[PDB]
Design a protein around this ligand. Structure first.
Ligand code: AV0
Ligand code: AV0
Ligand code: Y01
Ligand code: Y01
Ligand code: Y01
Ligand code: Y01
Ligand code: Y01
Ligand code: ZN
Ligand code: ZN
Ligand code: ZN
Ligand code: ZN
Ligand code: ZN
Ligand code: ZN
Lengths: 322, 323
């Protein structure tokens, strides 16, 4: 039911975006107009997750992809992780700008209400996405929703502090502080500890998001690159492969995984005599069993002049595998 | 080489960042310093390309990567393409924001000069980057990333020139204020309003062109990392030619995929009739694979029906076998 949760969250994002646009139009606040389009990024993340899930629904050999689209979910997870990292850097740059150029919010009450609505939406999204292969895509979506929830917590706390520990002027009163620039060059009621509360909270949220996102990005990149899974030791596999009767040379051992538990192995063997190859093949498959290998393709090279006899004419092109 | 070009572009980017920082310090135009900080996007793109180029040369097998890190270049190209797409979406969002509300530029002269310097730097970068496919994929990604900011600098220069030549300023307190832009504190612009919306429309056209030119690279990188059979290899024809040899009666699981550039790996299961004189047909299947772009193969003969493959696990789990 992965598609159901994604569709529900996407529908909620649309409803909350429409609510924010309506609130902005009725209150004629341009900041809410600006913030309404900021969830196009979340909508894009949900669309990418949905596309990856839909394309991973099919796993069949095709004239375009022999393996099928099994690697669609890991690609979607990688795309979501990169998008989240880019968003984190963008909001970090925005936080630096806020440090350099502080802003003063308008109507803290409506901002607090919007933040509370967003916080409820985000916490129920976490309730849907806490996971009550395909988990990596769900993990990336959950990380994105958690980043949105942290942003909502930040805006709620910022609005609460600005409403409880700040005092501005509603008219031309004498409270101008030269810390913030004034238009055309224009007291102690409103301290400066609040204007800088939003940027520091944003920086902390950026650090938390990067901390919790780095493992997902690392795993997605390691899957997309042809890396042996961390649960498989190459040295032990080689040791058990050479300790097999009838086989003495094992070259071209390439081990990698497509997605999830679909680990694929490939090796060449010098299997002594041709007639008794079949008995050795079952032992080789069993040996792959003790490890985590299952997809296999073993080449029984028969006959020290050359390591691999079935090699091509010229490999100087480096067009091979390793 | 290629690493030297990346180091040179990184040095130029850092020099331009220093130039914009000092210009902002001596001018107090904080938008210039904001753009200097934005150049961290180019810094990050060049750093990613540098890391990919450094790690791609480790072609030898490793205890953690049996294939080696020769997939690093294509992964770096994919990362740069996704970063460029995200930057393009951010630019389009900013253009929509400018439609929502415009801004008045403080001083067209210094921003025009900074834009000219950026245009020259980006033109030098384009000259560097215009001239294995995997090595070229990273080069093309960096070239597109440079061209995006080159177009951005061109937009800045054009807007500055038009704003200076064809707009009327309003600084001193007078009747020159117009509600076209919001008036702080509740407050006749003889300059045409056509200029207030020159950054956004040009940025929209630029992002359209950038997305159009970055779609092919992103698609190619995604296809390579999705184990898509290369477009120059036909699976059906290769199956038909493999089944034409005398010693093979049936082939299953012709897993063909592209590793990087011109490295295609094909693993196939064939059913040979007899172990005697088997090497006669192994040479033929290797040759017929060579007849195409596949040079690194691995074939498993199966000597023996109802079952499709006589070698399989005890459970034949559909979630643990390939395809
Ligand atoms: C973020 C997640 C990324 C991973 C997930 C996506 C990975 C890519 C998906 C592969 C992909 C794009 C590749 C290029 C863009 C890659 C962008 C990557 C960007 C990464 C950031 C291959 O592209 C297609 O491949 C087909 C097979 O080679 C072939 O066309 C073939 O279909 C033509 C149909 O019109 C047809 O006319 C032509 O005759 C065919 O031969 C063409 O090559 C091409 O159309 C698209 O998927 C393909 O298209 C359909 C999709 O739903 C899907 O069609 C089915 O349902 C349709 C319902 O309406 C309807 O048509 C049919 O019921 C059925 O056909 C295909 O089954 C699927 O395979
Ligand atoms: C945009 C595309 C980017 C693609 C990048 C592809 C390349 C990735 C390179 C990183 C990576 C692959 C894993 C992926 C990480 C995340 C990657 C990014 C993911 C998101 C995209 C391999 O790379 C490591 O990097 C080393 C430093 O450069 C280098 O070693 C250099 O050493 C000399 C000194 O420098 C130099 O003289 C020599 O010449 C180099 O050999 C080797 O290449 C390698 O060891 C890291 O893997 C492992 O990470 C471990 C710590 O987690 C850590 O392991 C260690 O454990 C013990 C100590 O705890 C120690 O006892 C082990 O011995 C050791 O193993 C190592 O780091 C590495 O084993
Ligand atoms: C949003 C896009 C455009 C960028 C995504 C972030 C990258 C800039 C990051 C993500 C993962 C990072 C890599 C993670 C791990 C390593 C291994 C690291 O190697 C070590 O130093 C190992 C330890 C040692 O040798 O002491 C070198 C940096 C590198 C390649 C990092 C380089 C920067 C990377 C690619
Ligand atoms: C240096 C610039 C480019 C910023 C990079 C991101 C930062 C926000 C830092 C702050 C805290 C860092 C994290 C703190 C510690 C770790 C250790 C490690 O993950 C763990 O926590 C494993 C256990 C351990 O801490 O050793 C991998 C990197 C990570 C997540 C770090 C990744 C980079 C983070 C998120
Ligand atoms: C999400 C994006 C912004 C990337 C953030 C992290 C990166 C800036 C990379 C670049 C270099 C990386 C570091 C390179 C070397 C190491 C040593 C490495 O040491 C170990 O393996 C100790 C055991 C352990 O991992 O617990 C731990 C990861 C760490 C800190 C890496 C953490 C991730 C780093 C900081
Ligand atoms: C988070 C962002 C930055 C990632 C990059 C942008 C993606 C949202 C885009 C880039 C390429 C797009 C894909 C390009 C091509 C297609 C094929 C398309 O299917 C067809 O056109 C096939 C024929 C048919 O219509 O049936 C379905 C959408 C899809 C997967 C697109 C989904 C959205 C993608 C992944
Ligand atoms: C959705 C909003 C936020 C941005 C919209 C930007 C558009 C102006 C861009 C985005 C992607 C672009 C498309 C990306 C890919 C192609 C394919 C390109 O060639 C083809 O039709 C097939 C190419 C092939 O098969 O290699 C023609 C332009 C087109 C439709 C582009 C037209 C312009 C598009 C729609
Ligand atoms: Zn061999
Ligand atoms: Zn090899
Ligand atoms: Zn078979
Ligand atoms: Zn060859
Ligand atoms: Zn098994
Ligand atoms: Zn298969």
């Amino acid at each position: 039911r992965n598609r159901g949760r994604l569709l529900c969250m996407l529908a909620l994002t649309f409803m909350f975006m429409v609510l924010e646009v309506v609130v902005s139009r009725v209150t004629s606040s341009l900041a809410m107009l600006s913030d309404s389009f900021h969830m196009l990024s979340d909508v894009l993340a949900l669309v990418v997750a949905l596309v990856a899930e839909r394309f991973a629904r099919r796993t069949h050999a095709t004239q375009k992809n022999t393996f099928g689209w099994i690697r669609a979910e890991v690609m979607g997870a990688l795309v979501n992780a990169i998008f989240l990292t880019g968003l984190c850097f963008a909001i970090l740059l925005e936080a630096i700008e806020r440090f350099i150029e502080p802003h003063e919010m308008q109507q803290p009450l409506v901002v607090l209400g919007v933040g509370v609505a967003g916080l409820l939406v985000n916490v129920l999204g976490l309730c849907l996405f806490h996971h009550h292969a395909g988990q990596l895509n769900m993990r990336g979506v959950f990380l994105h929703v958690l980043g949105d929830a942290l942003g909502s917590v930040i805006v709620v706390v910022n609005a609460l502090v600005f409403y409880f520990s700040w005092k501005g002027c509603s008219e031309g009163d004498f409270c101008v502080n030269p810390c913030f620039p004034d238009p055309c060059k224009a007291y102690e009621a409103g301290p400066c500890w609040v204007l800088y509360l939003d940027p520091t909270l944003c920086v902390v949220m950026v650090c938390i998001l990067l901390y919790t996102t780095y493992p997902l990005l690392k795993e997605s990149a390691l899957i997309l690159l042809q890396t042996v899974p961390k649960q498989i030791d190459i040295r032990n596999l080689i040791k058990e492969l050479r300790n097999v009767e009838g086989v003495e040379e094992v070259h071209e051992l390439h081990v990698w995984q497509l997605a999830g538990s679909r680990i694929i192995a490939t090796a060449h063997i010098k299997c002594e005599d041709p007639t008794s190859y079949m008995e050795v093949a079952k032992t080789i498959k069993d040996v792959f069993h003790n490890h985590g290998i299952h997809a296999t393709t073993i080449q029984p090279e028969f006959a020290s002049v050359v390591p691999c006899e079935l090699a091509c004419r010229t490999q100087c092109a480096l067009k091979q595998c390793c």
